[PDB]
Structure formats: structure tokens, C-alpha cells
Write a protein that binds this ligand. Sequence first.
Ligand SMILES: *[C@@H]1O[C@H](CO)[C@@H](O[C@@H]2O[C@H](CO)[C@@H](O)[C@H](O)[C@H]2NC(C)=O)[C@H](O)[C@H]1NC(C)=O
Ligand SMILES: *[C@@H]1O[C@H](CO)[C@@H](O)[C@H](O)[C@H]1NC(C)=O
Length: 121
Amino acid sequence: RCDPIRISMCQNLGYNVTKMPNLVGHELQTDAELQLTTFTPLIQYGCSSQLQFFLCSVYVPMCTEKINIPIGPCGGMCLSVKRRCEPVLKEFGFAWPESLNCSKFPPQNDHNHMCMEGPGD
Ligand SMILES: *[C@@H]1O[C@H](CO)[C@@H](O[C@@H]2O[C@H](CO)[C@@H](O)[C@H](O)[C@H]2NC(C)=O)[C@H](O)[C@H]1NC(C)=O
Ligand SMILES: *[C@@H]1O[C@H](CO)[C@@H](O)[C@H](O)[C@H]1NC(C)=O
């Protein structure tokens, strides 16, 4: 039921299996890996120690046999990462993309919603 993560920048997270489609709409890991390259300057810059985990959690979200939904990031981590990384996008004339809008993620790991919050699987 769950597929291993083929994306190289996503291979050290604490989980290693996923299920497409991801939280951005890709059916294929390979398309997600291509789109991920857009962010490598940001990752290289080091605006947030959580950026890689956050992007991987969105582009290649955690799958488990016990759960029928992709498990993505919590809104809290998204807001934290946005706070640190959006300034870098903006100084270069870009913006925090709509597809990473922090509203589309659950606010906290509830018993009413599941999401990840740190580099914790
Ligand atoms: C981010 O996502 C949120 C949640 O969908 C958006 O909030 C809605 O935005 C639309 C478009 O203007 C409004 O019609 C709704 O009334 C908004 N809902 C709420 C609760 O604010 C938001 O527009 C998106 N963009 C940003 C930058 O936050
Ligand atoms: C995936 O990662 C976990 C983390 O400890 C490891 O125990 C498991 O053997 C790994 N499996 C694969 C297929 O990478």
C-alpha cells in the first residue's frame, strides 16, 4: 500500500515511504523531484533548518499502512518556515507560493487531524 521514496533530497527524514498524490497534486514522484529543484538555492542558503523536512513532507508526504491519508506538515511548522524563508524569496522578487499556503495544513497534531511537526516522523 505504501511506496518507497525515490527522491534523493528526501531520503534522510525519519520516514521513507510515501503515497502519491502529494499535497501539491503530483501523481508522480519524478515530477515532484523536478519541482523540488526550484527550492535548492533556498535550501543551500539555510534560511530554516526545517525547510527540507517541510518540503519533503509536502512533496513526498508520509504514508503508513494504518492510515488512509497522506500525512503532511502541521500548520505550525509551515508558519515557522514561511517566516524565515519568505523574506529570502521576496528580496529576490519572488513570493511564498500559494501551493505552500499555510492554511491548507492542519494547525496542530490533534486527535482531530494528523500531521507532522518537526523532523519527527
Ligand atoms: C491562503 O489560504 C487561505 C485559506 O483558503 C485563503 O483564505 C481565503 O481566501 C479567499 C480568497 O480571498 C477568501 O475568499 C476567503 O474568505 C479566505 N478565507 C479565510 C478564512 O481567510 C487565503 O486567501 C490564501 N492566501 C493567503 C495569502 O493567505
Ligand atoms: C526505512 O527507515 C527506517 C527507519 O529506522 C528503517 O528502520 C527501515 O529499515 C527503512 N526501510 C527502508 C526500505 O528504507
